[PDB]
Structure formats: structure tokens, C-alpha cells
Amino acid sequence: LTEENAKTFLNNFNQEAEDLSYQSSLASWNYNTNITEENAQKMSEAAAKWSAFYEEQSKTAQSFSLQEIQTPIIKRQLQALQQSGSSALSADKNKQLNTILNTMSTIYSTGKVCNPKNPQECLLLEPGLDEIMATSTDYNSRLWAWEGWRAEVGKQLRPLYEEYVVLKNEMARANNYNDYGDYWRGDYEAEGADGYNYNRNQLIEDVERTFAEIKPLYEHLHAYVRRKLMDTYPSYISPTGCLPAHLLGDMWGRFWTNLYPLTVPFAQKPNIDVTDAMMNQGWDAERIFQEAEKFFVSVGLPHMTQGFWANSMLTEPADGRKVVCHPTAWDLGHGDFRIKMCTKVTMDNFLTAHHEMGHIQYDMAYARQPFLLRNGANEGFHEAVGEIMSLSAATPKHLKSIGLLPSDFQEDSETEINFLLKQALTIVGTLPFTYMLEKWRWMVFRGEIPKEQWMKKWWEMKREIVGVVEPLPHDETYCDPASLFHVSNDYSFIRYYTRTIYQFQFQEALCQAAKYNGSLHKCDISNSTEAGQKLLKMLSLGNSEPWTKALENVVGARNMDVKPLLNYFQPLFDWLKEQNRNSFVGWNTEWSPYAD
Amino acid sequence: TNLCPFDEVFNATRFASVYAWNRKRISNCVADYSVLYNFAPFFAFKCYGVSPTKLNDLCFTNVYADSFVIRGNEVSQIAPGQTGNIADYNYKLPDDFTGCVIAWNSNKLDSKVGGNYNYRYRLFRKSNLKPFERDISTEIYQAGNKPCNGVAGVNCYFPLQSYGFRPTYGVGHQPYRVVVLSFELLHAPATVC
Ligand SMILES: *[C@@H]1O[C@H](CO)[C@@H](O[C@@H]2O[C@H](CO)[C@@H](O)[C@H](O)[C@H]2NC(C)=O)[C@H](O)[C@H]1NC(C)=O
Ligand SMILES: *[C@@H]1O[C@H](CO)[C@@H](O)[C@H](O)[C@H]1NC(C)=O
């Protein structure tokens, strides 16, 4: 039978997985929103039940041939069920991996450093070091905070990361994969027809095919900031050298958005940073989220569910319970959607609200697909879907419509230039970081870097690729990369590289569909249902069709494309070239600020 | 005037499962359909056979009223000529159906934290139901060519599964009490007026 005998099995599996996976999500949400000792044990048991059931179902489903039988939908569902993955380990390995992950989470969650002058006052990262890295203007204090965070947590994660990577490579080898890097890269393998084909091996060769074309755009942006930072700390900057690793606007420098007031071209024009206006006019979290929802309603997307407002966190709990303030969008299951985020009255949070609500909208779109296909087409689509809304919501014309900007405001050459520079400082600044991190982790998972050369290779590639230098050499005994949340929680990072192109492609397609004319960076798709429908017809697909077809349905392409990004950033390249007439464009590995 | 017992079928502490609906023969009563709206919030009251307004000046013979509890997605499946997972194996209506349906939401009455598994529905019936057939029997359903003789394994399955209602599922997967009325005029003196 095969086909009709597997249809019945899938019917059995779906309406049992949908009920035994909801409890684990609910327990995880309860533990995350309220940290105690009972919730952790409840989550641990609820995860174990689901793991055992998934193992049994995968073993049952593995023996169904699939040589040439079945319809494509059944074939996709059954192969997804068969692929197994993390449940092909014995109990010993499973429990060791689980306790390693738990110890990682415990160490990273409550890391602390103390002020050298005042030993009593010891600060965490969320309330204590984020503010320092964002606003602190003392070079020595910033270096102190960076060194403390790199010296406390980095000590306690090296052996854990060694054991974790060893176990992950062993599991991936057992899962008929080359390594866990190949396990990560296998998400892009599409095979559903002729022409709609892709290979795991071809992903890496497409990365540098789009990095080199972006490399000289970043060089002019890196040089201009460094010359601008020459006067900020006149002694503590070497123009004939790279940039310090701690004066990058964050703890690691993922987003250089905090450098905008220290790199703004014009100081006389009204500042597009509307945090002051938001604070003055009397805004709160409810107002922020209602304004975010009105945008999606205007585009022509469904309203937020009634339970969303009554169940979402959206605010610091205060009270007496401890929570986790990492923004997330939750899809518990059976139709439940919630958002956990510790919102504050700023603009970064204003855009993060749009990002998370875009995640929620994409999750809502494919609710009618089968359980095994209720996923995004690939890991790099959620971020792009989220960001193509912040792109339209961040424009000064949109800011003026909601009354945030003055009603006598006038757009000129200054406003467009400033807007483009602010957007570039964030979008362009994160691509080298993402590429470096993902490449380094891929080499680590392939085992090409020894334990005695991890830091050496990491910093050498950082110097020759991104172009940032360190204030004091961190010995190999530490583990610098493990200090990141995604590294310590085992999250894929190349999605953060594919977003930076898919978002621009989707933005240009929506601008063309919305009957807009003019420059690309003044689109503001609003009150236009054409773009909404064009986006929804592909959002609703889910994982049922290959990502190549999913992309084509909107863009009319079948691979990555940098041309929309270059079109977006065209008006800045020329200005940077003209303004850098006396620039020493170029960084070197040999120049290190410290002695030897 | 002798009122008709509608309050004891519209106001009950517990309804019955989908696969075994609870039929009730109603006869020799004064049918007052105005008190149906006394509840007020109805998910769907548009109904077949007769005019939207009930036309209370209609005299019928015995009338059947059988009720159950389903999801919100499957409320639209209670209609003549409608197929699916619940109108083929659990409850089917005639193509010339006379009478109609009533449904409303109830989440603060029959859905408890931790889930209640007292509501069950049938799947894999092996043959689409004829109108008004119950099939309470629970024997393992054969899927293949192997004689499973009462033990559920390999490719032989158990036909009943539980809804497991919990609060905060959303309107789609949230309890909806459903009661339907079938009007009969098969000769004989007319009683239900
Ligand atoms: C946060 O979690 C703690 C325990 O994990 C909750 O404290 C208990 O909650 C359960 C749930 O009903 C009950 O036994 C009591 O309300 C609490 N136990 C005791 C001994 O007091 C706490 O209620 C949770 N916080 C919130 C806001 O739900
Ligand atoms: C249903 O019964 C409850 C309690 O018996 C009562 O409070 C309610 O009014 C009744 N609904 C009616 C009469 O419509």
C-alpha cells in the first residue's frame, strides 16, 4: 500500500503530536515568565515525554520505503518525520547533553562583574552592563566593563563548549551527516522538481559571491566612522590602525546604532532620533503596540487575537518574580500566540515591537498547514519578514504622519542623507560580524581549528575581515565567542546573514507592487492592500513548497541578489567617496595598541 | 399552558461526546422558540429548512433534538451535503434536511486548566455514515493486510481520541456546544404546536 498506509499513520500522528507538544511549550513559557524550582522540573519532564514520543514515531515512520510512491505532500511530511535528528542518541549521551545545556543556561543567565573601586556593587548584564555599553562615555570604564565580562563568563564556558561541540559532532555523524555544521546547512537543501533544486554544498560558495560585492561598501563606511571617532577620544584612537573592540556601541558590537550621535553629519537639523519626543508626548507600551498593530491593519493583515493582549507580557514584571528579558515571539500551539518582551520608551524597542509582531503575523499566516509543515520555508525568512515592516515604519514621512515629528518639518537633502546613514550603521555593520561568526563556528564544527589556536584564528580573521582590534590580548585559556547568547544557547546565525538580502529583495518587490515611484529608501508601504496580498500569498505557504518556489512567487528570482541592496544604499556610496578625499582607507593586522 | 422542555436540553451541566450524541424525542408540548434567543450570543443561528423567522404558527409531529460538543472549526461541518472528518464518521444529515442548527461558545464552563479529556470523537470508521447512525462500538481499525485480533499495534489503530480542552486556545480550537432540531411531519395527528 505504502501511500494509503502512510496517510493513516500521518492522520494518527498529527492529532497526538499537536496535543503532546502543547504542554511542553506551556511549561517552558511558564518557567520563562516566572523562575522558580517547580517550573524547571515541570519543563524537564514535559520535554522528556515529547522526546520519547517523537523517538517512537520516528522509528515507526522510518520503514516506509519512499522509492517511487506517494504524493509530494505526503513525501515531504514523511521525510521530515523520518529525518529524526537529536533523538538518535542513547540515554547516557542524551542526559549529558541536556545537563551541559542546562549548565550553559545557568552560567550565562546570572553572570556578574563587580566595580573595582566598590567591590560591594556587582552588576548583571541586562540592567547593569547594557546601559554602560550603550551610553557610557568613559574609555577606561568601557574597557573595564568589556574586560570584566570577558574575564568572568569566558572562564566558565570553555570546557562546557568543548564537551558540547564533541557531543554535537558525534550526534550529527550518527544522523548520517558529515558534521553538525552540515546539519545546520541542510536546511537550505530544496528538492521538489527539476529547476527547483539546491544542494547543501552550494550554500558556502554563494556567501563570498555576495560578500566581495559588499566588501568595498563597508570599507568606506568603516573609514568614515574611524575618522569621526578621531576627535571623540583624541588620545585613544589610532587613525593609522583599526578600531577598538569595546567602543562599538555594544558589548561585542553587533549593532553600531549607538554610534550615530557620535558620527552624525549634521547637528543643526532636527534629530531623527525621536526617543525624546516619545518620552515627552506620553507614550507607553500599550500605545507602542497599538501603533504597531495599526500599521499591519493598514497594510491589510489580520488583527491581533483577543488572547494576545490578555496573555502577553510586554512589560517588566517588577513585583517579586524574576524573568528573562530576551525578546521573543511565542507560538505555543493550538492557536495561542504571545509575546515576551521587557519594553521601554525608546526607539530601539519601538522597532523591536514591529519585528516581533512580524514574527507573530508570519506564524499566524500558516496556521492551516499540516503540523509537520507548520514552519517557515527556510530559517532566513522570519527575520526578513519582520524587518521589511520596520523598514517602512522607520521613514521620516511615517514618523511625521503619527505626529511624532513636527508638522512644520521639511524633508531635504539633509534628512535623506541622515536617514540613510542611520540605516547603514545598523544594516551594514552587522553583516561582517554575522559572516565571521558563522564561518568560525562552521570551521569549529568541522574541527579545523585546534584548542590551542581558537583565539588566534578568531582574532586573526576578525582583524583581516571585520577590522577591529583589541585593547589587551585575551589568552587562549578563555573562550570569547561563548560569551554571546546565540553561541551559548546553540542558535543558528547564518539566518542573520540571509535576512540582510531577502529583506531588501522583498522591500523592492513590495515597492514596485504598491505603485510607488521615486527612490527606494522612501517607500512607506501603508494603506496599500496590494503589497499585503502579495506578501500573504507566500506567507500562507508555510513549508509545503520549496524555498526556491516560495521566493519566486513574490520576487521572480531563484537565488540571492545584492542589486536591491546596492540600489538602496546608492546615495551613500558616492557621498562617502567624496567626503573621504583625505582618508587612509585600510586596516592592518600588525598594528596592535598594546605593547607586544 | 404546558410549556415545552427546552430549558433542560439547552441548560445542562454536561453534554455528550461527539461519537455518541444524545437524542431526545420531544412530543406533546407547546413549542416556544422565542426563548431560544433568551440566551443571546450565538456563534451561528442561520439555519436551513424554514424561514429565518421561525414562523411559530407551524404544527408538526414529534421533533428530535440531539446535542454534542465540538470545536469551533467543525461548526461549519453540520450542514447537508458537507463532507469532512466529522460529517462522515460521527454525524451526518440528510440531503433534504428539514430543521436546523444552533451553536454557541462555552469556554468558561467546560474547559479546565490541565485539560479535560471527557470529550471524545471517532476517526477511521472504515465507511461513511448513513444519516442518523451512531456506531458506539470501539474495535481496533484495520489498516493493511494483517489480522490484528484486538491488540493495537504496528498498523492497527484505536478509533477514538480526546479533544483535551484547555483555556487560551483561541476561537479556532475552543469548545462550542451544538444542538440541532429535526422537524418531522410523517402523517398522524399533529402534536407539537
Ligand atoms: C510563580 O511560580 C510559583 C511557583 O513556581 C508560584 O507559587 C505557587 O503557585 C502555585 C500555582 O497555583 C500555587 O501552589 C501557589 O499559588 C504558589 N505556592 C505557594 C506555596 O505559595 C507563583 O504563584 C507563580 N507566580 C505567578 C504570578 O503565577
Ligand atoms: C441556566 O441555569 C442556571 C443555573 O441553573 C441559571 O442561572 C440560568 O439562568 C439558566 N439559564 C436560562 C434560564 O436561560
Residue numbers in the entry:
A (entry chain A): 20 to 615
B (entry chain B): 333 to 525
What did the study's authors say about this model?
All of our structures show that mACE2/hACE2 bind the RBD of the Spike protein in the same manner at the binding interface of a RBD in the up-position. To gain structural information at side-chain level resolution of the binding interface, we performed image processing of the cryo-EM data by location-focused refinement on an ACE2-bound RBD that was the most well resolved.
The structure of the mACE2/BA.4/5 complex show crucial changes at patch 1, where the BA.4/5 mutation F486V loses Van der Waals interactions with adjacent mACE2 residues F83 and F28 compared to BA.1. Q493 on the Spike RBD also no longer forms interactions with mACE2 due to the loss of the longer favorable arginine side-chain. The combination of these two mutations allows for the BA.4/5 Spike to maintain high affinity interactions with both hACE2 and mACE2. Importantly, binding to mACE2 was unaffected even with the loss of two interactions. The hACE2/BA.4/5 complex is very similar to the mACE2/BA.4/5 complex with an overall RMSD of 0.6 Å.
